[PDB]
Tab-separated table of N, CA and C and ligand atoms in Angstrom:
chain	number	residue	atom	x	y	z
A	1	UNK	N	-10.999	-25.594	23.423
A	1	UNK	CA	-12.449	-25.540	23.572
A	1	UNK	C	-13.101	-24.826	22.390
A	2	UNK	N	-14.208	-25.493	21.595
A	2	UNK	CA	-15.106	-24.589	21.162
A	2	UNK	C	-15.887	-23.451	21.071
A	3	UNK	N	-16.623	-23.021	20.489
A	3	UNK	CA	-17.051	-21.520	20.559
A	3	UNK	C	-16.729	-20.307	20.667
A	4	UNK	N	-15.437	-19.966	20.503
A	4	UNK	CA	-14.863	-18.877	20.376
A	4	UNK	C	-14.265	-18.209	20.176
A	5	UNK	N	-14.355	-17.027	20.331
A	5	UNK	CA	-14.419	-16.095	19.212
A	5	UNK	C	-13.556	-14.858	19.259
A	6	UNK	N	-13.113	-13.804	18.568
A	6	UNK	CA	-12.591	-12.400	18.910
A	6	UNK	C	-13.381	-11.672	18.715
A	7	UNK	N	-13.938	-10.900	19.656
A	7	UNK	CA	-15.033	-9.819	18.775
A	7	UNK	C	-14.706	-8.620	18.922
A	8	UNK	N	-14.740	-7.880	17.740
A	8	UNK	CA	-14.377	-6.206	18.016
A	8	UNK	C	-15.423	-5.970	17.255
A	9	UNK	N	-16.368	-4.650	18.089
A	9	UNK	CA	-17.088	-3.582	17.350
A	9	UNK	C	-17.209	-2.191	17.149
A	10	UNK	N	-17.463	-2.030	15.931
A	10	UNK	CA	-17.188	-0.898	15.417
A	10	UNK	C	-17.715	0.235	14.161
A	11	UNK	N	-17.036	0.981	13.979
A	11	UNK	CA	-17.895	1.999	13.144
A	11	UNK	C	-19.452	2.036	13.480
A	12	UNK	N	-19.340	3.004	14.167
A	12	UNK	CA	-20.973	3.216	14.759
A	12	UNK	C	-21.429	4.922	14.382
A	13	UNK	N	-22.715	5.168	14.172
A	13	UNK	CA	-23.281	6.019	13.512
A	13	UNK	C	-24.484	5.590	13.418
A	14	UNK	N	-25.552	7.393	13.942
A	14	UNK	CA	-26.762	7.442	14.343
A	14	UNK	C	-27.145	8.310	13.164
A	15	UNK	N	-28.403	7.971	12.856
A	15	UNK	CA	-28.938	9.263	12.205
A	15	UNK	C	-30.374	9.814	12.353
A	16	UNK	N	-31.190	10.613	12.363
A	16	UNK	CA	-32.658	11.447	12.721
A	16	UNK	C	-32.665	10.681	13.812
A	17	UNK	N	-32.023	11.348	15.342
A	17	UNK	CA	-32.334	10.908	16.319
A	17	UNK	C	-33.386	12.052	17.061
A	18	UNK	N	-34.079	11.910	17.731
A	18	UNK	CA	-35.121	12.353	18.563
A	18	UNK	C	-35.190	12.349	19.780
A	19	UNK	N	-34.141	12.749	20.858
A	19	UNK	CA	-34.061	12.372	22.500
A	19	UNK	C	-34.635	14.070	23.019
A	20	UNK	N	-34.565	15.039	22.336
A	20	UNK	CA	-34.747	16.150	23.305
A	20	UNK	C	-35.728	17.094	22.185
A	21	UNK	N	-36.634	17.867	22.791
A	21	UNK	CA	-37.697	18.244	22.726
A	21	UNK	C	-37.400	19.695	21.992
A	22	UNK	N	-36.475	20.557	22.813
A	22	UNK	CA	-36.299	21.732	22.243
A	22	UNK	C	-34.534	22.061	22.102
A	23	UNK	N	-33.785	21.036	22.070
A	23	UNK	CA	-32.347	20.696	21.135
A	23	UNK	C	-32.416	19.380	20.276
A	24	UNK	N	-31.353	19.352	19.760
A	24	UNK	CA	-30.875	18.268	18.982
A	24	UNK	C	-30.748	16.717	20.108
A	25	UNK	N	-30.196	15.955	19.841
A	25	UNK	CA	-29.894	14.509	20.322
A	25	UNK	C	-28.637	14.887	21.070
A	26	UNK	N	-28.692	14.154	22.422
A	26	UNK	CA	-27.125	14.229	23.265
A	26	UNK	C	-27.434	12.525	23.226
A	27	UNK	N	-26.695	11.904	21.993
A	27	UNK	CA	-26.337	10.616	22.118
A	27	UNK	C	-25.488	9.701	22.345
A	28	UNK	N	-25.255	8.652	23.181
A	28	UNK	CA	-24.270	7.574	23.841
A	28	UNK	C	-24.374	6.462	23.510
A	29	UNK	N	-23.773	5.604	23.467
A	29	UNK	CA	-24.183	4.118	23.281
A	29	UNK	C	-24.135	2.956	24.502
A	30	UNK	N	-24.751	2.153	24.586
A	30	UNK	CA	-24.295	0.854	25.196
A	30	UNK	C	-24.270	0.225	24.708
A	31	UNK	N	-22.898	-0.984	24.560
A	31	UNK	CA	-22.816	-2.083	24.143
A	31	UNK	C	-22.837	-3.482	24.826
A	32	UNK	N	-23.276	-4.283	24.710
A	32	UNK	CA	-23.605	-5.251	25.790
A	32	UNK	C	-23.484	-7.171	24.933
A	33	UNK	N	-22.158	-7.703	25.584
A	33	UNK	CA	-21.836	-8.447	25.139
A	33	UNK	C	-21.343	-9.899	26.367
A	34	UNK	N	-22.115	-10.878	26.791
A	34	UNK	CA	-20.943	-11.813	27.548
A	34	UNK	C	-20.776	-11.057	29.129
A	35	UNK	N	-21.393	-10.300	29.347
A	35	UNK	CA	-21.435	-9.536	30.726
A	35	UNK	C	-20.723	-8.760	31.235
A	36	UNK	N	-19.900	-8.520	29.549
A	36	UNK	CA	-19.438	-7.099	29.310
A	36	UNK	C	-20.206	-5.889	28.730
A	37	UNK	N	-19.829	-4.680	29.213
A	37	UNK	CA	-20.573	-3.544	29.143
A	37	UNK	C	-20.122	-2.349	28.612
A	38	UNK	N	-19.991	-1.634	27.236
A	38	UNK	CA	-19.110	-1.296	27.036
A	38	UNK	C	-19.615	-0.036	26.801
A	39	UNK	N	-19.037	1.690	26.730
A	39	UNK	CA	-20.242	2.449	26.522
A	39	UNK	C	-19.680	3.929	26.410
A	40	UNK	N	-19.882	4.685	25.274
A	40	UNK	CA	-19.151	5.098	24.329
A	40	UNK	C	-19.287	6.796	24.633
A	41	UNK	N	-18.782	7.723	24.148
A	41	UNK	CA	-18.697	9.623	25.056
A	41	UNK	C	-20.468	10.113	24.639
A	42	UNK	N	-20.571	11.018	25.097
A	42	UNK	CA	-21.686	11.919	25.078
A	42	UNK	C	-21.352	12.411	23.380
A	43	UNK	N	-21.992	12.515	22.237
A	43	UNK	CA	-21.893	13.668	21.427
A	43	UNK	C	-23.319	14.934	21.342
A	44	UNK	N	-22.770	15.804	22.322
A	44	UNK	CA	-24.061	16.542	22.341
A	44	UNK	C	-24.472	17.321	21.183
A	45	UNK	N	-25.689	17.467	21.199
A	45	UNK	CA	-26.569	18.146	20.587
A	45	UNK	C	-26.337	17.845	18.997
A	46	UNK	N	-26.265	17.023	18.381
A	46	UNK	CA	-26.695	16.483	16.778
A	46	UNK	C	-27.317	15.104	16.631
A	47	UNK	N	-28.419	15.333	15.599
A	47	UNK	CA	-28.727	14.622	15.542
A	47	UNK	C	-28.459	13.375	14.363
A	48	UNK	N	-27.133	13.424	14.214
A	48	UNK	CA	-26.530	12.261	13.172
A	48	UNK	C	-25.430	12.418	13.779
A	49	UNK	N	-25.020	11.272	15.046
A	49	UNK	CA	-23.479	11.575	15.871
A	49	UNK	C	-22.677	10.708	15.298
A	50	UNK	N	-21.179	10.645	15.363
A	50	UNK	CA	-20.746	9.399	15.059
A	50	UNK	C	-19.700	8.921	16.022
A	51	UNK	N	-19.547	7.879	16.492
A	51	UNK	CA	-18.471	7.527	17.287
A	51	UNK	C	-17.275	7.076	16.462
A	52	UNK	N	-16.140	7.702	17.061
A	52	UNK	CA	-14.897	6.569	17.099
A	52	UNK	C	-13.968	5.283	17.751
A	53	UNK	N	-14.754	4.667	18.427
A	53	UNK	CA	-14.961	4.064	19.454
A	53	UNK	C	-14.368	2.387	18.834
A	54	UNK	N	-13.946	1.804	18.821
A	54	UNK	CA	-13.551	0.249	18.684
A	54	UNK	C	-13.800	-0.314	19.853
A	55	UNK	N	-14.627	-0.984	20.129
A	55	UNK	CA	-14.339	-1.778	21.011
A	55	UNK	C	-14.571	-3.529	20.794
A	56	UNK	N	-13.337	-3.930	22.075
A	56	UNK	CA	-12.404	-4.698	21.964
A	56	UNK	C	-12.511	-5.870	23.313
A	57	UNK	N	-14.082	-6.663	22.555
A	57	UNK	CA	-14.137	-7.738	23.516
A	57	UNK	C	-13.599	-8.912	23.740
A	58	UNK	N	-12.306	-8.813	22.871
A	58	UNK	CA	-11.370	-10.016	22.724
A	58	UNK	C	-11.950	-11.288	23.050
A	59	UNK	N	-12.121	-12.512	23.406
A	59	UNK	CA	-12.018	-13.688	23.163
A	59	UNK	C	-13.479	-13.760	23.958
A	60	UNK	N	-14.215	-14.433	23.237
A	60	UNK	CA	-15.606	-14.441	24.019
A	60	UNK	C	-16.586	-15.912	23.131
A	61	UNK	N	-17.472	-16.334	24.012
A	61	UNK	CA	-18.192	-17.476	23.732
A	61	UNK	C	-19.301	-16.772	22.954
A	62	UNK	N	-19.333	-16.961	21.735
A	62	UNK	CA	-19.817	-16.698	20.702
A	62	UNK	C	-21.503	-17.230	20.472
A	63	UNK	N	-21.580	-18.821	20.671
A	63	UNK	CA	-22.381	-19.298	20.758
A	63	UNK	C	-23.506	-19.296	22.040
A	64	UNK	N	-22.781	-19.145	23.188
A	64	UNK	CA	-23.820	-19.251	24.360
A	64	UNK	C	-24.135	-17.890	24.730
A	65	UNK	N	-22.732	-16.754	24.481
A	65	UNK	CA	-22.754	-15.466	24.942
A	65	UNK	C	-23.733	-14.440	25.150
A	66	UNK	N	-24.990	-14.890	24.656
A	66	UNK	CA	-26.147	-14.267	24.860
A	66	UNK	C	-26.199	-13.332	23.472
A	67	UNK	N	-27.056	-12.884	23.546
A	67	UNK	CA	-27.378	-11.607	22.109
A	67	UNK	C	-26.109	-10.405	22.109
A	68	UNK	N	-25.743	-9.949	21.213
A	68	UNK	CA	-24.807	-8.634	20.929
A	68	UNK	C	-26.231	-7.632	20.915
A	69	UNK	N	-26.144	-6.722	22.274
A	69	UNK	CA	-27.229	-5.933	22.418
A	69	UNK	C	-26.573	-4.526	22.504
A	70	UNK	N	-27.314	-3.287	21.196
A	70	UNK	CA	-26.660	-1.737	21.594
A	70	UNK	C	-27.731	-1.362	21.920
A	71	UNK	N	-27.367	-0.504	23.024
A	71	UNK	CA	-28.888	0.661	23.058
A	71	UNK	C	-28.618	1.736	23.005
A	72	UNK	N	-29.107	2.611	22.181
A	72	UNK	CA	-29.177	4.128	22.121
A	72	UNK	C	-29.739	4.883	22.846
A	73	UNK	N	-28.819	5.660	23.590
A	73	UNK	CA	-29.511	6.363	24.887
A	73	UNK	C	-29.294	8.048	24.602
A	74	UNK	N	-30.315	9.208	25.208
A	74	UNK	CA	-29.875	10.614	25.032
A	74	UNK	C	-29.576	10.560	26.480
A	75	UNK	N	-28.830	11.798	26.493
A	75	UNK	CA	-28.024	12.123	27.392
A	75	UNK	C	-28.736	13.224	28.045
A	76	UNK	N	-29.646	13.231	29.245
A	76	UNK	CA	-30.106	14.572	29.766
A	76	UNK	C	-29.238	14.569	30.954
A	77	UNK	N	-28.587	15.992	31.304
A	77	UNK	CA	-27.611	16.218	32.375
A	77	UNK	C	-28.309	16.501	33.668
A	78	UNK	N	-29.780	16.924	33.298
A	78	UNK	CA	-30.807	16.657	34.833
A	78	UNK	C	-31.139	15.497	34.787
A	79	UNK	N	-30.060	14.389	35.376
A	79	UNK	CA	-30.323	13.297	35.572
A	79	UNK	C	-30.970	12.232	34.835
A	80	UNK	N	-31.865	11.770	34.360
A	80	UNK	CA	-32.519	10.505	34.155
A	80	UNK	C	-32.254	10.774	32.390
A	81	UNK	N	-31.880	9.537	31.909
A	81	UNK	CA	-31.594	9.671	30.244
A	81	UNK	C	-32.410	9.027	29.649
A	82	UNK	N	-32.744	8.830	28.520
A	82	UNK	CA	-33.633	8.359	27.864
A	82	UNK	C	-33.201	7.650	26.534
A	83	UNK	N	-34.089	6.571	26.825
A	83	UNK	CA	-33.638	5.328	26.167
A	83	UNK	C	-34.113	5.309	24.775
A	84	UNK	N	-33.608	5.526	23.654
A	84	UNK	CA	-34.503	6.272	22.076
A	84	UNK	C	-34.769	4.243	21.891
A	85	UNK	N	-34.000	3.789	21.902
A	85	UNK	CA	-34.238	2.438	21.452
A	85	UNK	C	-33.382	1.230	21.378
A	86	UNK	N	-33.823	0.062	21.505
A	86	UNK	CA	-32.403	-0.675	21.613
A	86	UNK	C	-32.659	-1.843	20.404
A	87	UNK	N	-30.989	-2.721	20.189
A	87	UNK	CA	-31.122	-3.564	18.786
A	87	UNK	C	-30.196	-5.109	19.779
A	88	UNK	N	-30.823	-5.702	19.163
A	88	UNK	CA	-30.368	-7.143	19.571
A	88	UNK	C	-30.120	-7.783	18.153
A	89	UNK	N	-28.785	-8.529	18.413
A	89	UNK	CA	-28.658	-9.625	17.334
A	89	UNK	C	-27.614	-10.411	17.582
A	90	UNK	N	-27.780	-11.927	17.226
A	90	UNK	CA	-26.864	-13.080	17.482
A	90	UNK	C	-26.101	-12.848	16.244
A	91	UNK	N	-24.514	-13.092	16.977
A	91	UNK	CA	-23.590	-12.548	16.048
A	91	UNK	C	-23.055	-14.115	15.145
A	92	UNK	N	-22.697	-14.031	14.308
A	92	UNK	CA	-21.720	-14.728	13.163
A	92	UNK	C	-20.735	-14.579	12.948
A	93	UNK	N	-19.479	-15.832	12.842
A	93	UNK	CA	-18.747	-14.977	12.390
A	93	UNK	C	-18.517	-14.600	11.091
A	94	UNK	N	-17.278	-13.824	11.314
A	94	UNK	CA	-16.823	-13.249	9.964
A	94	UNK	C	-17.119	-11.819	9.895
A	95	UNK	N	-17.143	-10.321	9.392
A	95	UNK	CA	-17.689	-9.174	8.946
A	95	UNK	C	-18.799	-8.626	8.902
A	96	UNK	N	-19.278	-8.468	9.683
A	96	UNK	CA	-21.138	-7.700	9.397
A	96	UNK	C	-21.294	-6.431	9.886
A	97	UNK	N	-21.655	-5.918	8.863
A	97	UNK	CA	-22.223	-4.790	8.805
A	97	UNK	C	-24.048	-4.745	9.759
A	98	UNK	N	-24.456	-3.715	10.742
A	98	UNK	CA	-25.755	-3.931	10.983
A	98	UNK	C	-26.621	-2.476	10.868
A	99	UNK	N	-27.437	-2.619	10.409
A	99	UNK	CA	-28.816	-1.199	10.501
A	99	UNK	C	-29.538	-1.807	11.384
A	100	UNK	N	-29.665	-0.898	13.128
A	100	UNK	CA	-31.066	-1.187	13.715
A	100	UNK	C	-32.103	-0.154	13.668
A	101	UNK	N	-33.025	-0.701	13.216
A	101	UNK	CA	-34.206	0.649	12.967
A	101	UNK	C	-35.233	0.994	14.194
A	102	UNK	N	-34.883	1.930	14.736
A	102	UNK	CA	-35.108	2.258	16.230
A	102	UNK	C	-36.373	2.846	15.776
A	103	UNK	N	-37.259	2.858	17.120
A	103	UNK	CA	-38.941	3.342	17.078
A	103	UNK	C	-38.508	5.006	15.840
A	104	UNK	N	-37.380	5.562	16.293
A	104	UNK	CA	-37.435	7.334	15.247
A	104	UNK	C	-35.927	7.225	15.141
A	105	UNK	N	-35.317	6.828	14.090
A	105	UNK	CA	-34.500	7.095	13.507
A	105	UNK	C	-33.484	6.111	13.758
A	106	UNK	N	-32.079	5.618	13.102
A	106	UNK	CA	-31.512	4.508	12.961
A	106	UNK	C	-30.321	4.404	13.592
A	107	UNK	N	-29.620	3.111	13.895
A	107	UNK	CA	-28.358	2.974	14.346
A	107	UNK	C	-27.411	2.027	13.037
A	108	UNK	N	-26.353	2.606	13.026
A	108	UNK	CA	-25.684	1.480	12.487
A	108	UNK	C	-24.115	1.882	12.816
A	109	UNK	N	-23.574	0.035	12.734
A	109	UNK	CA	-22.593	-0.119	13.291
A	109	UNK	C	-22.119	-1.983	12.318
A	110	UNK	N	-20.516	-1.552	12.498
A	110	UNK	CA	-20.055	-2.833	12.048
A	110	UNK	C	-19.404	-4.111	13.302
A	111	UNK	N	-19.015	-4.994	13.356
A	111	UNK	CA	-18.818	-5.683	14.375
A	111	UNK	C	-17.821	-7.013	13.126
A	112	UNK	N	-16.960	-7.695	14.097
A	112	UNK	CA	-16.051	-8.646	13.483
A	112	UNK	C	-15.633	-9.854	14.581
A	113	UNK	N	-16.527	-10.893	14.281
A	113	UNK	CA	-16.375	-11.940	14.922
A	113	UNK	C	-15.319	-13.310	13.988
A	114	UNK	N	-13.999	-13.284	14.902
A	114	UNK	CA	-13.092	-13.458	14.037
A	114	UNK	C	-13.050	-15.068	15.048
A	115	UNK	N	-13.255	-16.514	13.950
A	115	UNK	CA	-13.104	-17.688	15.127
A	115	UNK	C	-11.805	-17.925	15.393
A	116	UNK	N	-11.168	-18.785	16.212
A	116	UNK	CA	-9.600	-18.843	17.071
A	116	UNK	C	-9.576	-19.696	15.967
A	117	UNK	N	-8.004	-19.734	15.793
A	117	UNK	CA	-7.159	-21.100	15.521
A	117	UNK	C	-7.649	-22.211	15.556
A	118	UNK	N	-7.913	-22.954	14.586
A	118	UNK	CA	-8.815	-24.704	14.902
A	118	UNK	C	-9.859	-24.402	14.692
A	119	UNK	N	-10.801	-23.529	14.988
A	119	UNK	CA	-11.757	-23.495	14.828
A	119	UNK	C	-12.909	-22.778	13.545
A	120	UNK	N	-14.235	-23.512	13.319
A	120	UNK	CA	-14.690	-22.723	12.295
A	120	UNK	C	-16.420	-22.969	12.322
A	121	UNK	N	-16.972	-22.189	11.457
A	121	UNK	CA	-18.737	-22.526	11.616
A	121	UNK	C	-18.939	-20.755	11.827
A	122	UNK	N	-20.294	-20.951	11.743
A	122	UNK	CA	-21.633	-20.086	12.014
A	122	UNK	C	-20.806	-19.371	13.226
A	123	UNK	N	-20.709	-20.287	14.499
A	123	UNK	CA	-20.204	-19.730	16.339
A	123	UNK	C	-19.195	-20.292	16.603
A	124	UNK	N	-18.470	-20.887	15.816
A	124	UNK	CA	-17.594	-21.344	15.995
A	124	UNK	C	-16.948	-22.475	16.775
A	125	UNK	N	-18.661	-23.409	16.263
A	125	UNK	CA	-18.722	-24.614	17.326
A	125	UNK	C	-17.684	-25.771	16.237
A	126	UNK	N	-17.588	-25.733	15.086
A	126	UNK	CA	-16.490	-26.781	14.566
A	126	UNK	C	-15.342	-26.558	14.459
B	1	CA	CA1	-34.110	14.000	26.419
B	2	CA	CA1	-29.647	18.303	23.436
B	3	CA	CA1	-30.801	15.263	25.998
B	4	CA	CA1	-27.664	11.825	33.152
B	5	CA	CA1	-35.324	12.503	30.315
């Protein structure tokens, strides 16, 4: 079958984040792929965090799979967290590097949409 794909994402890194008023950023990620949900530790209190995090959505429909969506969330431990901003983008394959430029300050992260055996294109519909 067509369309698909391996996807792993990775190398992720925030910088001038803004979630808390009188500390630094307690920032997390969500990753959201195919109706998978993937979602990365607390790094409290800085505001340029970085994850080490790979994640590893192995074989996924590339083309229909909906948007590769992260959102950057702070982490308040009295409950309710706050959402600094989120990035959507239809993935390609091959290597990409992405900058999302959030309402105050940025995300970036790399991602690798690798097509199967037989297959090739943009989503990996040929
Ligand atoms: Ca906050
Ligand atoms: Ca904090
Ligand atoms: Ca916080
Ligand atoms: Ca909480
Ligand atoms: Ca809050």
């Amino acid at each position: 079958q067509r369309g698909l794909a391996h996807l792993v994402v990775s190398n992720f890194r925030a910088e001038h984040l803004a979630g808390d008023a009188t500390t630094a950023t307690d920032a997390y990620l969500k990753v959201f792929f195919g109706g998978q949900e993937f979602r990365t530790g607390v790094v409290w209190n800085n505001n340029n965090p970085r994850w080490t995090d790979k994640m590893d959505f192995e074989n996924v429909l590339l083309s229909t799979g909906g948007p590769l969506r992260v959102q950057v969330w702070d982490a308040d431990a009295g409950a309710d967290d706050d959402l600094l901003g989120s990035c959507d983008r239809s993935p390609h394959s091959g290597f990409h590097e992405v900058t999302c430029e959030l309402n105050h300050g940025r995300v970036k992260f790399s991602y690798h949409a690798k097509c199967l055996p037989h297959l090739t294109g943009g989503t990996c519909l040929e």
